[PDB]
RNA sequence: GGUCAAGAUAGUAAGGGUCCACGGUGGAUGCCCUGGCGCUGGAGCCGAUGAAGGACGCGAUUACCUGCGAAAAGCCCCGA
């Protein structure tokens, strides 16, 4: 979600943990359209996770490569 | 008290007029400030690392404005 237990993971695991949220994030949209969206907060939260993910896989890209 | 004659004069308001009471309309006037103007001083360039200014988006619900930019009313770090 936010600490060093997130960045510690592999490169193809970062791409994997991005799309895992997106699969849910799309299912939430399909639920929203139907009228079974009792947890709207989950949508805001999942999108936040993808942001942090992409932010980090750009912090570690610049570090080492100088 | 009565009939006849001779005179004179009142009241009626379909509608109008002046004044008064009460209203409707309208937004003057007074009070206000959420907005402006001037002068004084500060500060004074932005852009191929892509501007000024825009299009289309981003919301559980989003027409308008705001903020943003598929990492989308926000993501990370430092400080208060």
Distance A44 CA to B58 C1' (A): 12
What is the experimental resolution, given in Å to one decimal place?
3.2
The rounded Cα A64 to chain-centroid distance in angstroms is 24
Q: Which positions ≥6 away from A24 have C-beta within 8 Å?
A: A46
Q: Quick one: angle between helices A11-34 and A40-62, nearest 10?
A: 160
Count of Cβ atoms closer than 10 Å to residue A53 Cβ = 20
Q: How many domains does chain A have?
A: 1
User: Which residues of A in 8-37 have their CB below 7 Å from strand B's atoms?
Assistant: 32, 37
Cα–Cα distance for residue pair A56/A4, rounded to 1 Å: 10
CB A46 under 7 Å to nucleic chain B? no
Method: X-ray
Cα–Cα distance for residue pair A27/A30, rounded to 1 Å: 5
Cα–Cα distance for residue pair A36/A39, rounded to 1 Å: 9
Q: Residue A30's domain spans which residues?
A: 1-66
Positive or negative, the CA dihedral A52, A54, A57, A59 is negative
């Amino acid at each position: 979600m936010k600490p060093s237990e997130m960045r510690n993971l592999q490169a193809t695991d970062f791409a994997k943990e991005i799309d895992a949220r997106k699969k849910e994030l799309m299912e939430l949209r399909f639920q929203a359209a139907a009228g079974q969206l009792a947890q709207p907060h989950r949508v805001r939260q999942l999108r936040r996770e993808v942001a942090q993910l992409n932010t980090v896989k750009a912090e570690l890209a610049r570090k080492g490569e100088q």
